[PDB]
Amino acid sequence: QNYGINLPITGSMDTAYANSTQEETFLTSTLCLYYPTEAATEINDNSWKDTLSQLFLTKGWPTGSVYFKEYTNIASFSVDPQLYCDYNVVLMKYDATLQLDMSELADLILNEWLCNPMDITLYYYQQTDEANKWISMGSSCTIKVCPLNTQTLGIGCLTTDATTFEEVATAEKLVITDVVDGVNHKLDVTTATCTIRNCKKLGPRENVAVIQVGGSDILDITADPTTAPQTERMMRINWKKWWQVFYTVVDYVDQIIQVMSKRSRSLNSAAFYYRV
């Protein structure tokens, strides 16, 4: 039914509303709760997943609809984060050391990135506009950037010596690199354990929320210094026991689901707008 074309939509400003339809969303869709692997250590139970899923039945979700996964830390969750089910929300502890790496994970999963491959040996590289970033993840990434000129000579670097290159990353599981836009560069990714990837952001992701368990509330999801917005789906709650953290999520499903939406890529109507 006319998948590729864009067509305008008209509609009157005097039309009666539909029904409530928040219930029917709970009957059909799925839910994924994520937690660090030390949360289940304090719980001291092998049936607490059974215990929680009895409590989700009260708020309308059926039995086989809520899925639970684990991770060790945000350093090892971020080597490959992939979100599978319809709605989900992630839970992370506050670390005063991991300032930037909490903002990297909240950049990677809360937005949507269109990505192209790269070849360090063969070509020379540059960023076109403000939406172009170099997302690189793996076991151990170390990136050195040698900027060139209009004659392809080095500026501050020797284009043969790899020691005179200029380092932006050291042994990280994930890197998002912003360099100056419009200058050809020469690259030194250790590609045996890393994988650099020319990416490009579209509009953000609508089905994931982030619960920052404890600490202050700072997350630079954007790239500029001049702004740093705190959107609807990033939030913060304090803790002493991981039981109380889980009871608050189960009690207030109807508000957390309200703040997020379905992934607009996942629909039928995006059939040639990058996701069938």
Partner 1 sequence: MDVLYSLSKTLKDARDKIVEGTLYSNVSDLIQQFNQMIITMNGNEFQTGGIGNLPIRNWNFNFGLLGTTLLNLDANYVETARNTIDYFVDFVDNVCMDEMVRESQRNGIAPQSDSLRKLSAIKFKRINFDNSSEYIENWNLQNRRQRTGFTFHKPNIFPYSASFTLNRSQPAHDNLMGTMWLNAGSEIQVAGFDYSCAINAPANIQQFEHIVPLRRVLTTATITLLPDAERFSFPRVINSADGATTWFFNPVILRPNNVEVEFLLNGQIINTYQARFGTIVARNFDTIRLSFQLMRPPNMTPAVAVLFPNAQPFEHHATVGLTLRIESAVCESVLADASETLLANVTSVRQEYAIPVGPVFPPGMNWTDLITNYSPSREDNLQRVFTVASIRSMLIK
Binding-site annotation: residue ranges:
45, 127, 156, 164, 166, 178-179, 181, 251
Q: Applying CB under 8 A, does 18 fall inside the site for partner 1?
A: yes
Among positions 3-42, residues that touch ligand NAG (CB under 6 A) are 18-19
Q: Which of partner 1, Ca ion, ligand NAG, none does residue 45 bind (CB under 5 to 8 Å by kind)?
A: none
Annotated binding site for Ca(2+): 45, 127, 156, 164, 166, 178-179, 181, 251
Distances (CA, A) of 50 to 64, 95, 177, 242: 11, 30, 42, 16
CA dihedral 261, 267, 270, 271 (to 10 degrees): 160
Spatial CA neighbour of 183 closest among 206, 210, 156: 156
* Residue 264 touches which member of ligand NAG, Ca ion, partner 1, none, C-beta under 5-8 Å by kind: partner 1
Strand partners, 88: 32, 208
Residue 188's binding partner out of Ca ion, ligand NAG, partner 1, none, with CB under 5 to 8 Å set by partner kind: none
**How many C-beta neighbours within 10 Å does residue 76 have?**
12
Burial profile 174-209: b = 16 or more Cβ within 10 angstroms, e = fewer: bbbbebeeeeebbbbbbbeebebebbbbeeebbbbb
Residues in the chain: 276
Q: Which of 50, 57, 271, 274 binds partner 1 (CB under 8 A)?
A: 271
Choose, by CB under 8 A, the member of 46, 163, 227, 268 that binds partner 1.
227
Instruction: Write out the residues near ligand NAG by the rule CB under 6 A.
Output: 18-19
Q: Which residues bind partner 1 (CB under 8 A)?
A: 1-6, 8-18, 21, 130, 203-204, 206, 222, 224, 227, 229, 231, 261-262, 264, 267, 271-272
